[PDB]
Design a binder for this molecule. Structure first.
Ligand SMILES: O=C(O)CCCCNS(=O)(=O)c1ccc(Br)c2ccccc12
Length: 136
């Protein structure tokens, strides 16, 4: 295959800043101990594309996770904080939009390229967290 617009996400990324993530996790329903340990994590994210399949891997001292998916096609995800969710990821004008649904709740995670950074915006109801990754 030739290039895909999704190739702009491809690579190895490291978390350099996090804002409001504790309050985001609170809104999501994450328990005290998990929030404290998860909040300390400075994960590496490795994104790759192979045909129609996109893979996002996260490695940290908190948890190692991996999801593989096709855009617009719902899949089962066990999140880092051990929620069992139904996830659908789509592209909207260059932005990967990831919706997680569980227990009648919903949260949206947007991943976008901004300058040389990968910016992750997590929203749960009225609460937004911004996490910024740089190339590793
Ligand atoms: O990848 C990031 O740095 C942003 C976090 C994405 C949030 N959704 S998640 O289920 O993949 C997730 C990923 C990583 C951590 Br640490 C989480 C902690 C609490 C709740 C969710 C967490």
């Amino acid at each position: 295959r030739g290039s895909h617009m999704c190739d702009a996400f491809v690579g190895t990324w490291k978390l350099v800043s996090s804002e409001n993530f504790d309050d985001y996790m609170k809104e999501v329903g994450v328990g005290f101990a998990t929030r404290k340990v998860a909040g300390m994590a400075k994960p590496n994210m490795i994104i790759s594309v192979n045909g129609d399949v996109i893979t996002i891997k996260s490695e940290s001292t908190f948890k190692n996770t991996e999801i593989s998916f096709i855009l617009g096609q719902e899949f089962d995800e066990v999140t880092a904080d051990d929620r069992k969710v139904k996830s659908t990821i789509t592209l909207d004008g260059g932005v990967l939009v990831h919706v997680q649904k569980w227990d009648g709740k919903s949260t949206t995670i947007k991943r976008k390229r901004e300058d040389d950074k990968l910016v992750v915006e997590c929203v749960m109801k009225g609460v937004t967290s911004t996490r910024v990754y740089e190339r590793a």
